[PDB]
Amino acid sequence: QVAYLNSLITDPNATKHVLYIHMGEPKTNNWDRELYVNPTTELQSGKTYTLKLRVKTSAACDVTVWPQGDATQYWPTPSFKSTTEWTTVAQAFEAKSALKQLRFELGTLGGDIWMDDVQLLDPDGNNLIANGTFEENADGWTKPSWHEYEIKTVADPDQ
């Protein structure tokens, strides 16, 4: 009872938690620093999916996202933009094949990136992101083992 009642309390100034990557200096290629998440249902060819999230970076940038199955989808994608203040993102794209992974291409970026409230909605509205709130951890978010950075969750920096 007590746990449930606590969970229902709205409180905008309670500590929020977000995904945080300290990227450091820019690398040479897009693919030199990648962050991965897998939709809980494989994306289907011909269906349009909408990536929603809020994002903040230490410098204004484009954030490239390539969906991936047996082939990579370079266009159209849910790639988006970030600024130094939290902004909301909503980007739709039609899958052109069966896609099982979203690749965040962070290689050419420098500094810091924070993300939160990540959703991926199929045409009916089903959310295919298992862990988009980061209030416990960043389970489900991975990287190549040889990419030397840490995937963390932290208190929202702008609170």
In the complex, which residues of this chain contact Ca ion (CB under 5 A)?
16-17, 116, 133-134
Strand partners, 20: 114, 152
In the block, tokens 């896609």 appear at: 99
Measured from the CB atom, the residue of 76 and 140 that comes closer to Ca ion is 140
Helix (H, G, I), strand (E, B) or coil at 4: helix
CB of 86 to Ca ion, least distance (A): 11
Residue 135, annotated ligand binder? Answer: yes
Q: Tell me whether residue 71 or residue 90 sits nearer to Ca ion (CB atom).
A: 90
Task: Give the shortest CB-55-to-Ca ion separation in angstroms.
Answer: 12
**Which of 120, 123, 121, 154 lies closest to 136, judged by CA?**
154
Please, which residue, 94 or 135, has the CB nearer to Ca ion?
Answer: 135
C-alpha 93/C-alpha 101 separation (Å) is: 14
Rounded distance, CA 143 to CA 14, Å?
30
Is 116 among the annotated ligand-binding positions?
yes
Query: Which residues sit in the known binding site?
Result: 17, 116, 133, 135
Annotated binding site for Ca(2+): which residue ranges? 17, 116, 133, 135
